[PDB]
Design a protein around this ligand. Structure first.
Ligand SMILES: NC(=O)c1ccc[n+]([C@@H]2O[C@H](COP(=O)([O-])OP(=O)(O)OC[C@H]3O[C@@H](n4cnc5c(N)ncnc54)[C@H](O)[C@@H]3O)[C@@H](O)[C@H]2O)c1
Ligand SMILES: [K+]
Ligand SMILES: [K+]
Ligand SMILES: [Mg+2]
Ligand SMILES: [Mg+2]
Ligand SMILES: [Mg+2]
Ligand SMILES: [Mg+2]
Ligand SMILES: [Mg+2]
Lengths: 56, 309, 56, 123, 33, 30, 255, 248
RNA sequence: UGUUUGCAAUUUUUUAUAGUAUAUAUCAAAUCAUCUUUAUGCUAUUCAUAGACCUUGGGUACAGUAUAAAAAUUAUAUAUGUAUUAAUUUACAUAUAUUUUUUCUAAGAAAUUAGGUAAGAUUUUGUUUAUAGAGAAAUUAGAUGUAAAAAAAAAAUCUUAUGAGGGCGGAUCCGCUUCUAAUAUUUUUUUGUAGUUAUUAUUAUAAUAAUAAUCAUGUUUAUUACUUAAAAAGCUUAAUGGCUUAAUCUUGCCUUACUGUUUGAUUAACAACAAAUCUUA
C-alpha cells in the first residue's frame, strides 16, 4: 500500500524586485515584503560589467 | 462534408461569449444568501484513496493533475525571467556557437556495444561472460551534440547542509531546516550520517543535516536570486571553480555561512535565528546537458563567471 | 518446490529435464509429463495437458 | 529557546495533519477547471511547436549556408572546403571566455531601467 | 426555499425513515442474539 | 454546536435589548 | 421538479439559480480558456477540409504517376485517412459538454469521439481485470491460442451483476443470462455468442471434455446497443439459436 | 489567458498552502508589525496583495473564481497594489503616519520609451520587446554590412573587420561563432561575377553605430525590426535572411 | 440534510415507479474527517449625547473591481467602574486565570523487529567524477543505450494441436499418415516505409521531388517497455549454493509460528533401528 504523499509548502507571495538600474520584475518568494530594492547586484558589479568605467 | 457530420453538433466551444445583462445578474454571493438553505449534496462522493493499493484494486487514485488529488500542486504563477531569456536569446546562440555540419546523406552512426563479447573460433569463447567496461569500472554516458533537438537547460537544484555539530547541540539542525525552507520554499528532508569517525565525533545513523530539491520554474527563480542578488554581494568572490562537474552535466558548488545569510529570504528575518547558527549549503545544479563543457557553457549563458581551478 | 528447495512431483508421470527460454532466459527446470513421449517445454499456444485423477 | 520555539511553530503548521485538505469540487466547478487545464496544456503545445519551429528554421539556414560553403572554392587560390573547415573549428567555444558575461548577465525584465540603452559607451 | 423546502423535507423524510428502519431492525437482531 | 452558539447569542441579544429598553425609560423619568 | 430532471441537487439548483448554459457562465479563466479551445477547434476543422481535399487530388490521380504504382498510392491515402480520424476526435476532446454527455450516459455512440472515451474508460479498469481472468484461469491456451479482447461484455443473472470468475449457485444460473455488451468501432456487424464449459470430467478416458451450453449466430450489433437477453434471441432480436441455454451443473467431487 | 490563469492558480494556492505566520518575520509590537496589521486589515486579512479578497476557509471558500472583465487579475492592478503596500504606514515610534504625509515609492519606468513614440529608427532603446537589426544603405540598396573576403582572413575574421569599418569601434559586440547562419547567392550573368554572401550572427550589448569616415560608401543606417525589414529589403535578399529570424 | 453550494460525473446493493428483463430516481456501504452561525459581530460615516477632549448609543452603507454585511465567533470563576434588579439579576468594560474550537513545541526530526499475505520498488556494495567549512578518512548530487504512425504478401523447412471428433491398420488407445492452423525457422521472394511541421528545387497559395526533425491532446520532474559484464551489498549468525522476473527492501492489514488425522519420498535418510528432514490430503 504505497502512501500518496501530500506537498507541504509554506505561504508564498508575489514580489517586485527592483535592481540597481531601476529595472523591475515580479517573482515568487516566501518573504512577505512587496518590493525588494537591491542596491548591489549584477548590474552594479565589476565582475559582471568589466567594460563599465564608472565601476572601475 | 461527411467528415464534419461525424463531429458533435451541440458544440459548446462554438457558443457566443456571455452578455453583460446576464453578467450583471450573475452574483454567486447573492444566490447563497437568498437561498436560505443548504443545497442537497450530490450522490457522486468519490474521494482519492490515501494509499495506492494496486492497479486492479477497486478504488484507484487519480493523476496528480487532478485538483481533487492529494498530490495536486497549483500550476505556474508566473514566468521565470531566466527561462524566457534563455529561450528567446540564448537558445539559438548556443545552437549557433556549437554546431557541426553533417553532410546531407551522411550514414547513421551505429553505437558500439560497450560490453564486448568474446568472438573467435576457440571453443571456450562461445559462452564466456561479456567483458568488463574497458577502462573505468562503470560506463560513462556518451556526450550528445548540441542541436536544435537538444539544447542544455536547467532541470532541478538540490541544496543541502551538513551539520555534524547538530549531534551535540540539536538546535543547529532546527535552524538549518528553517533556512533551507525560506531559501528554497520547500520542506527539507532530514539526512543522517553514514560513517563512524571518532576523531571528528561523527556517529553513524544520526540526523546530521537536511536537503531540498526544487524543480521547474522554482529552479529558474532560485538561480535568478543567486546569480544576480547573492553572488554579487559575496566579498572577494572569484567565481565558480572551473573544475566543477561530475562528467554528466551537473555543476556543484558551495556557499559559506556568511554568504547564505545574504539571501533576501534569510536576511529579512535574520534576527529570528540564534546567533552563529546559520549554516552553509551545497548547491548541485542538475542540467539536461550531457558533458562538463556543455554544463559550463550553459551556466556561462546564464551569467555565471568561472575562474581557473 | 519444498521449503529446502527440494523439487517434488505433483502428479504421476515421467521426469523431464529441460530449459524454457520463453519464461526465463537462463533457468533450467524439472517437469513431470503424463506421457513418456511428450517433450517439454510445451509450446505456449498448445492446450494444457491434464488428467482427471478421479474415480466414479 | 524562545527563538527556537518560533522555528518549531513554523514546522508544526506544515505538519501533514495541519495543512489544508485536498480540494472538493462539484461537477460544474470540476468541469470548469478541466477546461482551464485542457486549455493551458494546449497553449503550452502551441508555444512549444512555435518555439521548435524557429529552432528548426534557424538550423536549416545554417545547413544550407554550410553545405553551400562546403562546395565553394576560394577565395582565389584557396582550395575547396577551406572556409568550411575553418568555420567548423571550435577554438575557445568551450573555454572560460567563450561567452561574454556582459551579454549573458543581462536578462529580460518586466520594465526597463532608468537608462534603457547606453549610447555613450566608448571602447 | 419554497420548492427547496419540499425537497429538503423529502431528504429529511428519507433519512428519518431509514433511521427508523435501522432501529426497527437493530432491535430484532438484539432479540435473536 | 454552531446553532447552539447562535441561539445563545440571539438569546443574549434579547437580554441586551431588554436592558437598553428598561434603562432608557428610567433615564427620562429622572 | 420531478425525477426526470436528475438528482435532488440538480432539481434544487435548477430552481434557485438562473437559467444560463454552462458554457456561458461569466468566469474569467473559464471564458478565456474556452476561447483558446474555440479558435483551435476551428483550426482542426480547417485542417480536415485541407486533408479532405488533398485526398481527392490523390484519388483522381493516375497510378502510373506514382513511382510506386497503386501500392504507394493506397499507403498514402491510408495515412491521410487515419490522420483525419484523429482530427475528428481532437476537435471535441476538449469540449466540456461532450465530457458531461458521455459521463451522463447520454452520449451518441455513432460518433468517433464518444466511442473513443468509452474505449478509453473500458481499458482503464475493466480490461485489466478481464485480461487477468483469461490468463489465471488458463482460458488461453486451453480454448484459444492467443486472445486479446476488443469489446466489453458484462453478464448479469436475473438482473444481479456477477463479477468475472465468480462461483454462482446452480439455481441462480438456471435461466439464460443477459449480456450487456459494448463495441468501440463503427458500423454494424453480426455477432456469435458461445458458452463453453471447459472442465466436463470424462472418467472413461481420464480427461476433460468441452460442452457447449449455448450457441447463437447472426446477431446484429451496433455501437448504440447495450443489452442482449439470451432468452429472446429468435423472438425479439434477430438471430439463429443453434442450442438453447443448458443449465450449468457440476457433479459432486469434481473441481 | 495567461494573466487569468496565474490569478486562478494563485488562489488555488491559497487553499493548499500552509497559513502565513507573521511571528516568523515581524517581532510583536514593533514598527514593522504595526504596519503589517494596518494594511492587513484593509486587505480583510488576506496576507497576499495580488489575489484580491478571498478566504480559503469558511462558508464562502467555494466562491474563488473571478468574473469576466475583472481588473483584479490584470498586471496593472497587481503592481498598483504591490506598490501601495511598500509605503511605510507606521513611523519608527509606532504611530500611524498621516494619510497626506505618506511618501509614495518611485514607480517603474514605462515599457514604451520616447523613441517608440518618436519612431526614431536610429535608436537602440526602441521596441524593447523585439529584436532590432542593423540595416545599412550604400551609395542605393539597403543591406547588412558586407565585404569581400581576402585570402588571409576567414569568414569570422572578415566580418569583425568590416563591422568596425562600416559601423565604428564604439559598439560592444560579440560574434556568436564561426558558423554562417544564412547565405545569399547571386548567380552569374554569362559577363558578370556571382556573389556568395555568408552571413554571421552578431549581438550588440552597448554603444551606437557610427558611419563617420567609413571605408565603404555607406550613407545611412537604421535599426529595424523583423516586420520593417521586409518592407525595406528586397524580396530575394530578404527571403534568404528570414530563416535566421527569431520569434520576437 | 456529512461531503463545497450552478445542474443526472466512481463501484456494488436496497427501495419505488414506469416497464417486461431493461430504464430512471432513491437508499446503504466503500473511497475522504472540507473547515459550513446568511448574522448575532466587525468596519467606515453620521447623528444625538457630556462640555474640556466622555461612556452608552441611534441611523446610514445596497455589495462582480463582490461587500461594513465575518481571516475564523466558546464557556466559566474572581473581582472592578459605569449601570440595573425581588438577586453577584441584567448590561458594560478592563483587571486574569481557566477551558472549547486539534489551530502553532518539527515523529512526514527519533527506534537497523527478522513471520503470514497483498501491492509497489529493483545494483542497493565497491570503484569513480565533482562538491562551503572538509584534511587519507564527514554530507549531497551523479555515472548504458534503444524503442514507442503503420505494415501486407508468396513459397519452403521442421515442431506442436482437447484442429478438420480426417484417412488406414490394429472421435477420444497406438505406429504409420495427407490437409489446415499456430509459434519458430530461411540469407529466404519481396512490396511499402507514409502523414505532419519546416527547408530546398521545379511547376501554376497549391502540386511534385529530395533533405531534416517527429513516443506525445499530455500538469517535462513526462511516461511506458526493453536493456545496463562479473564481483559485491542485503537475506538471524561461518562457509558454500541460491535469489534480483524475489527468497531483498518499503507500506497496508494481520499472527496458518493453527487443532486432529493422514499421503508419497529422502533411488527404502544416517551403507541397521531410533531421535530426524521434505512433502500430500
Ligand atoms: N510535455 C509534453 O507534452 C511534451 C510534448 C512534446 C515534447 N515535449 C518535450 O518537452 C521538452 C520541453 O519541455 P515542454 O515543452 O514539455 O514544457 P515547458 O517548458 O513548456 O513547461 C515547463 C514548465 O514551464 C511552465 N510554463 C510553460 N509555459 C509557461 C508560461 N507561458 N507561463 C508560465 N509558466 C509556463 C510549465 O507549466 C512547466 O512548469 C522538449 O524536449 C519537448 O520536445 C514535451
Ligand atoms: K510551452
Ligand atoms: K509485511
Ligand atoms: Mg552490473
Ligand atoms: Mg554506492
Ligand atoms: Mg576535503
Ligand atoms: Mg526475510
Ligand atoms: Mg537405508
Amino acid at each position: 500500500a504505497t502512501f500518496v504523499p501530500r506537498h507541504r509548502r509554506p505561504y508564498q507571495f508575489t514580489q517586485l524586485v527592483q535592481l540597481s538600474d531601476g529595472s523591475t520584475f515580479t517573482v515568487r518568494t516566501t518573504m512577505p515584503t512587496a518590493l525588494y530594492k537591491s542596491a548591489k547586484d549584477s548590474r552594479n558589479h565589476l565582475l559582471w560589467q568589466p567594460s563599465d568605467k564608472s565601476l572601475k | 462534408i461527411p467528415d464534419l457530420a461525424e463531429l458533435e453538433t451541440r458544440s459548446a466551444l462554438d457558443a457566443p461569449i456571455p452578455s453583460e445583462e446576464d453578467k450583471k445578474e450573475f452574483r454567486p454571493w447573492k444566490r447563497a444568501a437568498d437561498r436560505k438553505a443548504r443545497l442537497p449534496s450530490s450522490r457522486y462522493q468519490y474521494h482519492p484513496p490515501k494509499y495506492n493499493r494496486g492497479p486492479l484494486h477497486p478504488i484507484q487514485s487519480p493523476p496528480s493533475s487532478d485538483p481533487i488529488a492529494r498530490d495536486f500542486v497549483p500550476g505556474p504563477f508566473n514566468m521565470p525571467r531566466l527561462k524566457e531569456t534563455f529561450r528567446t536569446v540564448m537558445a539559438s546562440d548556443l545552437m549557433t556557437l556549437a554546431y557541426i555540419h553533417t553532410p546531407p546523406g551522411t550514414p547513421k552512426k551505429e553505437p558500439t556495444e560497450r560490453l564486448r563479447a568474446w568472438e573467435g573460433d576457440s571453443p571456450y569463447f562461445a559462452n564466456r561472460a561479456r567483458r568488463a567496461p574497458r577502462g573505468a569500472p562503470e560506463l560513462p554516458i556518451r556526450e550528445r551534440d548540441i542541436s536544435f533537438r537538444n539544447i542544455p537547460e536547467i532541470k532541478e537544484i538540490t541544496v543541502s547542509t551538513f551539520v555534524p555539530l547538530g549531534l551535540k547541540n540539536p538546535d543547529l539542525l532546527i535552524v538549518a531546516r528553517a533556512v533551507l525552507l525560506a531559501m528554497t520554499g520547500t520542506m527539507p528532508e532530514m539526512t543522517r550520517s553514514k560513517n563512524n569517525v571518532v576523531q571528528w565525533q561523527l556517529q553513524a545513523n544520526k540526523p546530521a543535516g537536511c536537503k531540498t530539491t526544487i524543480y521547474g520554474n522554482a529552479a529558474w527563480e532560485f538561480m535568478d536570486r543567486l546569480i544576480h542578488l547573492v553572488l554579487p554581494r559575496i566579498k572577494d568572490w572569484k567565481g565558480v571553480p572551473a573544475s566543477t562537474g561530475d562528467g554528466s552535466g551537473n555543476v556543484q558548488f558551495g556557499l559559506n555561512p556568511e554568504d547564505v545569510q545574504l539571501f533576501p529570504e534569510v536576511e529579512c528575518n535574520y534576527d529570528m535565528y540564534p546567533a552563529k547558527m546559520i549554516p552553509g549549503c551545497h548547491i548541485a545544479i542538475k542540467t539536461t546537458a550531457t558533458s562538463d563543457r556543455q554544463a559550463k557553457l550553459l551556466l556561462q549563458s546564464l551569467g555565471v563567471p568561472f575562474y581557473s581551478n | 518446490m519444498g521449503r529446502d528447495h527440494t523439487i517434488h512431483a505433483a502428479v504421476a508421470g515421467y521426469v523431464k529435464y529441460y530449459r524454457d527460454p520463453q519464461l526465463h532466459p537462463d533457468r533450467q527446470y524439472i517437469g513431470v509429463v503424463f506421457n513418456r513421449n511428450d517433450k517439454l517445454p510445451y509450446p505456449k499456444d498448445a492446450p494444457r495437458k491434464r488428467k482427471l485423477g478421479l474415480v466414479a | 529557546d524562545p527563538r527556537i520555539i518560533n522555528i518549531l511553530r513554523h514546522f508544526a503548521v506544515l505538519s501533514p495533519k495541519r495543512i489544508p485538505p485536498p480540494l472538493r469540487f462539484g461537477r460544474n466547478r470540476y468541469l470548469r477547471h478541466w477546461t482551464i487545464h485542457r486549455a493551458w496544456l494546449l497553449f503550452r503545445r502551441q508555444q512549444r511547436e512555435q518555439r521548435e519551429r524557429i529552432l528548426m528554421q534557424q538550423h536549416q539556414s545554417m545547413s544550407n549556408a554550410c553545405e553551400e560553403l562546403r562546395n565553394t572554392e576560394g577565395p582565389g587560390t584557396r582550395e575547396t572546403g577551406y572556409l568550411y573547415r575553418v568555420a567548423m573549428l571550435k577554438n575557445g567555444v568551450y573555454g572560460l571566455k567563450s561567452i561574454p558575461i556582459e551579454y549573458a548577465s543581462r536578462a529580460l525584465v518586466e520594465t526597463p531601467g532608468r537608462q534603457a540603452w547606453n549610447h555613450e559607451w566608448k571602447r | 426555499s419554497s420548492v427547496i423546502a419540499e425537497l429538503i423535507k423529502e431528504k429529511l423524510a428519507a433519512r428519518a425513515e431509514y433511521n427508523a428502519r435501522q432501529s426497527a431492525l437493530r432491535k430484532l437482531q438484539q432479540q435473536k442474539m | 454546536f454552531l446553532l447552539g452558539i447562535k441561539e445563545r447569542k440571539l438569546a443574549k441579544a434579547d437580554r441586551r435589548e431588554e436592558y437598553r429598553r428598561r434603562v432608557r425609560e428610567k433615564r427620562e423619568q429622572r | 421538479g420531478g425525477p426526470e430532471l436528475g438528482s435532488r441537487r440538480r432539481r434544487a439548483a435548477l430552481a434557485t439559480t438562473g437559467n444560463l448554459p454552462f458554457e456561458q457562465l461569466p468566469y474569467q479563466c473559464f471564458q478565456d480558456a474556452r476561447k483558446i479551445l474555440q479558435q483551435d477547434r476551428a483550426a482542426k476543422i480547417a485542417q480536415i477540409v485541407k486533408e479532405t481535399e488533398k485526398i481527392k487530388l490523390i484519388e483522381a490521380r493516375d497510378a502510373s504517376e506514382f513511382e510506386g504504382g497503386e501500392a504507394a498510392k493506397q499507403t498514402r491515402i491510408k495515412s491521410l485517412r487515419k490522420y483525419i480520424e484523429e482530427l475528428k476526435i481532437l476537435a471535441d476532446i476538449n469540449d466540456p459538454e461532450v465530457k458531461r454527455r458521455f459521463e451522463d450516459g447520454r452520449g451518441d455512440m455513432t460518433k468517433p469521439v464518444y466511442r473513443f472515451m468509452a474505449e478509453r474508460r473500458w481499458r482503464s479498469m475493466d480490461y485489466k481485470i478481464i485480461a487477468q481472468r483469461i490468463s489465471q484461469f488458463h482460458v488461453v491456451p486451453d480454448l484459444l491460442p492467443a486472445f486479446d479482447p476488443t469489446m466489453d461484455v458484462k453478464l448479469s443473472f436475473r438482473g444481479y451483476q456477477v463479477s468475472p470468475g465468480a462461483i454462482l449457485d446452480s439455481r441462480v444460473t438456471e435461466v439464460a443470462p443477459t449480456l450487456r455488451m459494448q463495441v468501440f468501432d463503427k458500423g454494424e456487424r453480426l455477432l456469435t455468442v458461445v458458452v463453453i464449459d471447459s472442465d466436463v470430467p470424462d472418467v472413461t478416458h481420464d480427461n476433460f471434455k468441452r460442452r457447449c451450453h449455448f450457441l447463437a449466430a447472426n446477431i446484429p450489433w451496433d455501437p448504440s446497443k447495450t443489452v442482449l437477453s439470451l432468452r429472446s434471441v429468435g423472438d425479439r432480436v434477430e438471430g439463429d439459436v443453434g442450442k438453447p441455454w443448458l443449465p450449468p451443473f457440476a457433479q459432486k467431487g469434481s473441481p | 489567458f495567461e494573466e487569468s490563469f496565474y490569478f486562478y492558480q494563485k488562489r488555488l494556492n491559497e487553499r493548499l498552502t500552509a497559513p502565513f505566520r507573521k511571528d516568523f518575520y515581524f517581532k510583536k509590537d514593533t514598527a514593522a508589525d504595526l504596519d503589517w496589521r494596518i494594511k492587513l486589515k484593509e486587505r480583510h486579512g488576506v496576507p497576499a496583495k495580488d489575489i484580491g479578497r478571498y478566504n480559503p476557509r469558511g462558508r464562502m471558500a467555494w466562491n474563488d473564481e473571478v468574473l469576466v472583465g475583472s481588473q483584479t487579475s490584470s498586471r496593472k492592478h497587481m503592481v498598483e497594489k504591490l506598490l501601495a503596500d511598500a509605503e511605510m504606514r507606521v513611523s519608527e515610534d509606532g504611530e500611524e503616519i498621516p494619510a497626506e504625509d505618506r511618501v509614495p515609492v518611485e514607480k517603474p519606468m514605462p515599457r514604451r520609451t520616447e523613441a517608440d513614440e518618436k519612431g526614431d529608427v536610429k535608436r537602440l532603446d526602441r521596441a524593447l520587446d523585439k529584436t532590432l537589426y542593423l540595416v545599412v544603405k550604400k551609395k542605393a540598396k539597403w543591406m547588412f554590412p558586407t565585404g569581400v573576403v581576402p585570402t588571409d582572413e576567414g569568414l569570422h575574421e572578415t566580418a569583425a573587420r568590416i563591422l568596425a569599418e562600416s559601423a565604428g569601434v564604439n559598439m560592444n559586440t560579440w560574434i556568436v561563432g564561426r558558423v554562417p547562419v544564412a547565405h545569399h547567392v547571386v548567380r552569374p550573368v554569362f559577363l558578370k561575377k556571382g556573389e556568395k554572401i555568408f552571413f554571421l550572427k552578431g549581438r550588440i550589448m552597448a554603444g551606437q553605430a557610427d558611419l563617420t569616415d567609413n571605408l565603404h560608401d555607406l550613407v545611412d543606417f537604421k535599426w529595424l525590426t523583423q516586420e520593417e525589414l521586409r518592407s525595406t529589403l528586397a524580396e530575394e535578399y530578404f527571403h534568404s535572411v528570414k530563416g535566421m529570424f527569431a520569434e520576437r
